[PDB]
Design a protein around this ligand. Structure first.
Ligand SMILES: *[C@@H]1O[C@H](CO)[C@@H](O)[C@H](O)[C@H]1NC(C)=O
Lengths: 49, 48
């Protein structure tokens, strides 16, 4: 590995992520984007499912 | 799902289970997804 080598003989750091899709109890989840809370109005609420 | 419910109770009875009512709060749900058919308690020795 030299810096003068062209692109293709240069080092590439590779990270491979592996998942199992919805067959066991899951421990890794994506983030939840909660909005602001509005009171005293007829709204459609979604609280923790 | 492995549900662990637990309750801490301050008692002062010597030998047996006290007679009373105490509902166990849900403590922790565990994502284990495994078969379990047998169990064993773990104790601690005292060495001198
Ligand atoms: C769980 O284990 C018991 C005893 O080892 C066995 O009889 C049972 O079929 C197993 N269950 C599954 C879903 O493999």
């Amino acid at each position: 590995f030299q810096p003068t080598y062209g692109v293709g003989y240069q080092p590439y750091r590779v990270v491979v992520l592996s998942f199992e899709l919805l067959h066991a109890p899951a421990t890794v989840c994506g983030p939840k984007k909660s909005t602001n809370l509005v009171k005293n109005k007829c709204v459609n609420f979604n609280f923790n499912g | 799902y492995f549900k662990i419910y637990s309750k801490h109770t301050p008692i002062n009875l010597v030998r047996d289970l006290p007679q009373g009512f105490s509902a166990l709060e849900p403590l922790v749900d565990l994502p284990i997804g495994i078969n379990i058919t047998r169990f064993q308690t773990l104790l601690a020795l005292h060495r001198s």
